[PDB]
């Protein structure tokens, strides 16, 4: 009784902006806001439980830790407590990171200068 409208596939941020454009975005944002970390937060490509986030490109104050950031993203997605949520950077879960996001940036940032995160309702695919 419902009909599926097929739809174009979901494009990632790296698909939408070229590498050189991303590199310049970060160079500018780091000069203008040296205390903010430039983060790209995207839903895992095969995710079927969690909704899509309203935006993609974030500036996160450098002292914010991962437990704080998880709380912010769950709030932005308007999740209830019954809903699981995992935030992954480069193939590993950010739940138990102690450090501020400043240190995650230093360890994990892309070549382009963004820190990429993916969320999902499971930790491993």
SS3 label, residue 115: strand
Smallest Cα–Cα separation from 13: which of 52, 56, 73? 56
Resolution, given in Å to one decimal, reads: 1.7
| Distance, C-alpha 113 to centroid of its chain | 14
SS3 label, residue 21: helix
Q: For the chain, which domains are there?
A: 1-125 (3.10.20.90)
Q: How was this structure determined?
A: X-ray
- Residue 93 buriedness (CB in 10 A; 0-12 / 13-18 / 19+): middle
């Amino acid at each position: 009784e419902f009909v599926e409208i097929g739809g174009p596939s979901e494009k990632t941020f790296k698909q939408r902006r070229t590498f050189e454009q991303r590199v310049e975005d970060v160079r500018l944002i780091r000069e203008q806001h040296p205390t903010k970390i430039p983060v790209i937060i995207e839903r895992y490509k095969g995710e079927k439980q969690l909704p899509v986030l309203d935006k993609t490109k974030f500036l996160v104050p450098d002292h914010v830790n991962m437990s704080e950031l998880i709380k912010i993203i769950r709030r932005r997605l308007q999740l209830n407590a019954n809903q699981a949520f995992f935030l992954l950077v480069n193939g590993h879960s950010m739940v138990s990171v102690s450090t501020p996001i400043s240190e995650v940036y230093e360890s994990e940032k892309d070549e382009d200068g963004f820190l990429y995160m993916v969320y999902a309702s499971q930790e491993t695919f």
